[PDB]
Write a protein that binds this ligand. Structure first.
Ligand SMILES: [NH3+][C@@H](Cc1c(-c2nnn(Cc3cccc(Cl)c3)n2)o[nH]c1=O)C(=O)O
Ligand SMILES: [NH3+][C@@H](Cc1c(-c2nnn(Cc3cccc(Cl)c3)n2)o[nH]c1=O)C(=O)O
Ligand SMILES: [Cl-]
Ligand SMILES: [Cl-]
Ligand SMILES: [Cl-]
Ligand SMILES: [Cl-]
Ligand SMILES: [Cl-]
Lengths: 256, 254
């Protein structure tokens, strides 16, 4: 690279977190987490300096159907605000058409979060009932998945979600988790298995993952199309995996 | 023109059809990869011819000369246009060819004959009574040669100095070596084949311990190929539509 690399990411524990004493720290030293360590290791094996930045709008990435404008970390790569995205960013077909992804460094699938005691076990259960509302993050891969799915059960769920009143969408993942906890079992949150399981095993220990994953995908490091950094970043990811660092980082950062 | 697809004869990925001697062309073969090639050829809009890799190898290179063999070599040296097989995505392979995003996941595991006193990779590295090795021309050999983890590096130090040779030249040779060694050989292979062989007679093998790593199979094309981008989007499409899970269930006793 010829400049200091601008890395965009999102504040999502345990991937990126503010240090207890971040107010006294400068630059990259303010943050900590799985993706903070991963960026240092990618930058080390690619030979560039980098500055960690938090995505301005706090979004993963969605595409406006009318204007085709992207937002979130995806938009920051498409419109030249960032050089690389190191975050739990899901590899998707639609995103792969405007940005480049490295090979996945972590796997996941869409899963269901419920409040302990809710009579729900699968997405089939959710689509066949009207007592428990459900929704997902509005600006992420999960919304994209349901919007595009030709699969009957998932299309039926999408049709219900976008027509529900009050809205069942949430604009952050934390909003979704909180909605489950305060809805007395009347709201089920559709989110990725990684965060679902993470929340499950932590206080107040009142949420739970039910059913199996709805699909199988992974997180990847993203760069803009044509960037002379994607090839290097891709090899770095594969080297860190083959050397065993990704397993070490997983164990490092991963109660009820 | 017609795209030359290189693959390898491994069940249930690629197999000979019943009465294959009387069939011609692509109709001689069937399996997960045979169905997968048709789907990718459909979404990418090209005609293709299935061919089995000449040397029956997955792909390794000489450390000094950097010359490749196996399916990787057929792509690097212009003998095939695309590889559709259980070919593992690795660092060294991605330096000379391109891979799509993984269409299937797997890890390195340990195969033993039933009754062998082994449960993990650490157990093997702590002794020599029970020999252990892996395929010589594959990604598992690359893993043990390039792994920075201590226990794996000790297994590599043992393998390349053991006597008689613990390496094998085909996966069938490794499995046969476990079944014939009366419990004195452990074969390091990928979990997909380990668990598949486990549920097939003679039913005298089993998988012990968790996977030593986590990786995936990807569709390979030579660098600069005009099929690369399209093939990658096809895999992601087939995954989104659930067809990869359909093929798995379709093609996947003790
Ligand atoms: N990853 C999706 C976003 C996304 C998620 C999601 N779930 N978990 N993450 C990351 C995460 C946060 C906190 C803790 C842990 Cl363990 C993992 N993203 O769920 N629906 C979506 O749409 C995207 O790229 O749009
Ligand atoms: N995949 C590796 C080869 C490779 C394998 C391996 N194991 N299983 N396969 C594919 C397979 C065969 C038979 C049945 C089933 Cl289910 C799966 N390849 O083990 N060590 C290696 O080095 C490579 O690309 O080099
Ligand atoms: Cl993982
Ligand atoms: Cl359906
Ligand atoms: Cl021709
Ligand atoms: Cl899989
Ligand atoms: Cl170690």
């Amino acid at each position: 690279a010829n400049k200091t690399v601008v890395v965009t990411t999102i504040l999502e524990s345990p991937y990126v977190m503010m240090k207890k004493n971040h107010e006294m720290l400068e630059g990259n030293e303010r943050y900590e987490g799985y993706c903070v360590d991963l960026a240092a290791e990618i930058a080390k094996h690619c030979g560039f300096k980098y500055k960690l930045t938090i995505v301005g709008d706090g979004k993963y990435g969605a595409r406006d159907a009318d204007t085709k404008i992207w937002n979130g970390m995806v938009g920051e790569l498409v419109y030249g605000k960032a050089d690389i995205a190191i975050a739990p960013l899901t590899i998707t077909l639609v995103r792969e058409e405007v940005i480049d992804f490295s090979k996945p460094f972590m796997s996941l699938g869409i899963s269901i979060m419920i409040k302990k005691g809710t009579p729900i076990e699968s997405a089939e259960d959710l689509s066949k009932q009207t007592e428990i509302a459900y929704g997902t993050l509005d600006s992420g891969s999960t919304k994209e998945f349901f919007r595009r799915s030709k699969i009957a059960v998932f299309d039926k769920m999408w049709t219900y979600m976008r027509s529900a009143e009050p809205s069942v969408f949430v604009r952050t993942t934390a909003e979704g988790v909180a909605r489950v906890r305060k809805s007395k079992g009347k709201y089920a949150y559709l989110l990725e298995s990684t965060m679902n399981e993470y929340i499950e095993q932590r206080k107040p220990c009142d949420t739970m993952k039910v059913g199996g994953n709805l699909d199988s995908k992974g997180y990847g490091i993203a760069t803009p199309k044509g960037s002379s950094l994607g090839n290097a970043v891709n090899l770095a990811v594969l080297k860190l995996n083959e050397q065993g660092l990704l397993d070490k980082l997983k164990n490092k950062w991963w109660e009820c």
